[PDB]
Symmetry: C3
Subunit: 181 residues, 3 copies
């Protein structure tokens, strides 16, 4: 259809494929296994810890609002199903805790369904974390840090995202070029 | 197994909450209104009948990083939904809409919400003819949806939020030991 | 009775509205497009074919409490094999502004309504940030959309149709509240 759009996308593809400074895929930290949820931009870091199942979830999708936004959702599940969820953002290489809540069953915490989110929306989301004592919140940070949820992992998530966004952008340019053919 | 420093900090925090003498007390609702939570949630419904109509003032007791939804159902099924904000003890009408049946209106759940987002949400209440706006507010105040109710909802949600926070520390404590 | 004064109030407003001679006229859609309402809703699809492609421009005549100035549209371009581009644009000052471009392997994945359909899309790659794209590429996308009838004339239609449809729903709303008060 549009020769001009095919040319613009072709050149961009050529610019990207020829770069000598594309983001390098980072190496995950010790103990964690990266598992992309099939077909999506969602990834689950996982590992066991003293009988607990740990999951660190994050999307490589970019938010058109806060471009520097790098949110993560960490789930810590006990043998009886009791799960803690901690929401953190990665801001200037540091982890910032934004929410802490609990669920009776692991499945309801990690389910990606719309009806599951609606279930979770009804429950108690926890207190306003930015209004908690330094001692309590700092202990929660250390508790997470000892389990591997630390600044090195935040760095990995950010570097992995830059890398994945680059590959997806290349795929996006290819598809756009196909549409302009 | 777990982490003792967090067990102690949550324990210390629990001691401080249970030792307070300035904690919010559970207020009582205005006459007729039956307070009933949805099992295992922070959603609360104040229900009662009024001249054949089934009323429901719904609010959540969770905080965001005070709003109510008033459902008025006719015997036919016709349901009005009034979204109100509790500013300084007083009420501010923000939205008015309608549904053929009470199910679609009150139904929580993702799919029910999606259907609602597709339907006409109503005119902008602020642009409405002021004589009609008066009459709707009178219409609501007659059914007990007034500044006395907006007062309860506020005080009640403070109370429920203290309870959930205490259970949250108990849960987190149990979690770290 | 208070619910009797509401009846009189809605009845007076309906009479008022029904007797106006300055109400919004329903606009005429640009060439090729067909207007089709999603039954019972404020969602509308403008459909048309162009060089084997199935085009859909989707919008709602509902207005946001705060955003009573912007009009969002979702443009779908579906190929023969089902692969579908979605372009999100806003209409501001009679000007089309491009806010997002993304692709899907299948048409239903892109265009299905519902909570679950949205949630599935929420997990997929939504495309790059449009602000960070080069002028050349983004300008060529705008032209590409323009060739297909997605231009300022289409935007003006949507704006005009929203004003008209909003008046119609308000009138139905007055009747329904009046019924409620009767």
């Amino acid at each position: 259809s549009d020769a001009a759009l095919a040319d613009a996308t072709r050149r961009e593809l050529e610019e990207e494929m020829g770069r000598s400074d594309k983001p390098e895929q980072p190496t995950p930290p010790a103990g964690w296994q990266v598992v992309r949820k099939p077909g999506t931009c969602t990834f689950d870091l996982t590992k066991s810890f003293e009988g607990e199942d740990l999951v660190v979830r994050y999307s490589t999708n970019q938010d058109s609002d806060k471009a520097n936004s790098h949110n993560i959702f960490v789930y810590i599940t006990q043998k009886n199903g009791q799960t803690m969820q901690a929401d953190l953002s990665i801001e200037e290489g540091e982890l910032v805790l934004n929410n802490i809540r609990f669920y009776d069953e692991a499945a309801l915490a990690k389910d990606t369904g719309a009806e599951a989110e609606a279930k979770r929306n009804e429950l108690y989301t926890g207190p306003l974390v930015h209004e908690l004592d330094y001692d309590l919140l700092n202990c929660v940070m250390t508790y997470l840090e000892k389990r591997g949820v630390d600044e090195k992992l935040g760095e990995f998530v950010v570097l992995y995202s830059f890398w994945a966004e680059q590959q997806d952008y290349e795929a996006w340019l290819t598809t756009m070029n196909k549409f302009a053919s």
